[PDB]
Symmetry: D2
């Protein structure tokens, strides 16, 4: 399974994610695309001669590649629709309020304005404070360490996203200061942190 931990950043909480049992795989083939599914849900695709269906010349998914594949599976007759939400998941947010977690003690529940909406995320970073601009890994974001941010819940209260630190953003070497990263007012709430 997977394990995420970060004392000074989020808190002295370990997060174990487990992949559940998987049934036998089924393969529905049509033309050059084979739809593979486990149970009733589709769990993947094997599209052949992909080179003549998409520009594939460390291949990383892009809104345009997904479009190409979507176009191909559709041309094959399948109706399933690939996740095509390429909205930035790492964004600049503003910490409106910070309050004590009702029953955690070293954790705070924050209300972070992220422009498109306001997120309630639980954070244990000792350096976080209201009035700060920070980068939040919204639900869906994929952490360098592997973990995928989900609509979690920390000891009772819901948490939708994570306040990032240098490490979280991908910094190779461990920084002297390990709390979360505080951006200058220069940054704009709602804007993507990455280009």
């Amino acid at each position: 399974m997977n394990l995420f931990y970060n004392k000074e950043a989020v808190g002295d909480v370990a997060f174990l994610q487990i992949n559940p049992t998987e049934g036998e795989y089924n393969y529905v083939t049509q033309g050059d695309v084979v739809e593979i599914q486990n149970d009733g849900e589709v769990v993947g695709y094997n599209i052949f001669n992909a080179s003549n269906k998409a520009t594939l010349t460390h291949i990383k998914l892009t809104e345009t590649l997904v479009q190409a594949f979507q176009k191909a599976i559709e041309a094959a007759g399948f109706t399933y629709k690939l996740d095509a939400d390429f909205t930035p998941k790492f964004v600049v947010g503003y910490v409106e309020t910070k309050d004590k977690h009702p029953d955690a003690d070293k954790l705070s529940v924050l209300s972070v304005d992220v422009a498109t909406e306001k997120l309630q995320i639980v954070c244990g970073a000792p350096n976080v404070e209201a009035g700060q601009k920070v980068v939040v890994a919204k639900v869906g974001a994929v952490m360098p360490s592997g973990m995928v941010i989900k609509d979690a819940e920390l000891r009772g209260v819901a948490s939708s996203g994570m306040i990032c630190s240098m490490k979280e953003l991908g910094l190779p070497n461990a920084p002297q200061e390990k709390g979360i990263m505080v951006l200058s007012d220069d940054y704009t709430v709602g804007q993507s942190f990455f280009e």
Copy 2:
């Protein structure tokens, strides 16, 4: 959603992996460990004050960490029993036979001896041949590019594992030769490729 493709080493086929949207999540809390489950299956754990339950000072799961966590969730009253498989997933294999794929043309179906068992994997690498010792990414292995090797099937015939190339093993720069990597007889079938 994961995407694998490597015209040179595997073949001109793109493997898309999808995780079917998980329903609601339920949280059963007892002491410092919260058992989280989706449907009836447990899908994870949030163990708090993990630092005083395990030695957590790029945290990667080890038989000993899992033991620590298992001891903690049990002490909390839960009966679920965490996984393991720490058996090496990248191993040295021997290509016993190589035959033409009944209906693929540029793909071959191989029978690879991996000591503990014999695997039938489909490979399109132009340089692969019978009599070669090679490194196979068995089912379960996690490819640097993200994808997780599964009990697949390529155009009809089953494929359990993947014959690796320099890139697949994690080589930073693209090598001149892009087929799969052929090891010298020095290597032992069944042994892990990594330390």
Copy 3:
């Protein structure tokens, strides 16, 4: 040779570093250590059976390894002394003053307090301002991109160090904001940026 360039963070200035060409190497051998020198200067060492002289089990020099090697070359009779400073080269600095470069136009000359001393560094980053706390790569620091910060000079005025940006500090993905990184007052002038 190597080439450094970072319009947005330092200025429209291409940095070419060049290694002059050496010649004849001489080898003075004593016991297990061979002192190699070019001209009259020592340019290296080959210490044999190093395993029984130091703990070498991506080997990176540490104050302690250098000590071990120093002890060995001395025990061999050589008097040369290895440079073992190890003082942090990436530190938090305070921008005291910012003035226009006498004849550059898009560059500013800054006076940065770095606790142990005050450094005059020339910077073209558009977002830098007096009153800001920033991380400076002092003379000697080794930039991820290869270049080694030296007691430079930009169009006339001397520059001892470089004001860093996300990229410079080792961030994998290009950030939306490309100027230099502005730290919060939380940071302490003179302290190392890295742990």
Copy 4:
């Protein structure tokens, strides 16, 4: 300084490369290019407004960039001529002969055919043998670990290059087999290992 050590691949010999303490730097300015030199040798260049002199939009030197810079420093009046060696440094070589090192015991002196020439390199890798095709890091090559291969000498006999192993070529994880890498006959002597 750098450090290199591969007990199993190269030998129980630690190589220290030392950066000879350079005195002052001198700056000769003409137009937009400043020629910087240490002693009498030129050690670099700072060409300003480089964007309007070359196409600079992880900047890595190319025969064309060097041409652009060369054209600029010349237009400024300087006569120095940029080096820039672009011949592959990591190549496929053939181990013609392998003999015992006259006085090292666990080292062998090899005669490696590299097509353009024959190199005498000293190697301690236990798995190396005559008749093998291997990848050699010729003089000039830059090892991932930092060190720069030079016209060395190991306990008496000269060594021009290094026989590489997985680690040396940049493999992230430590391999089970740590000797040098033996290529299949498929590889061609003299050809670059990297694309």
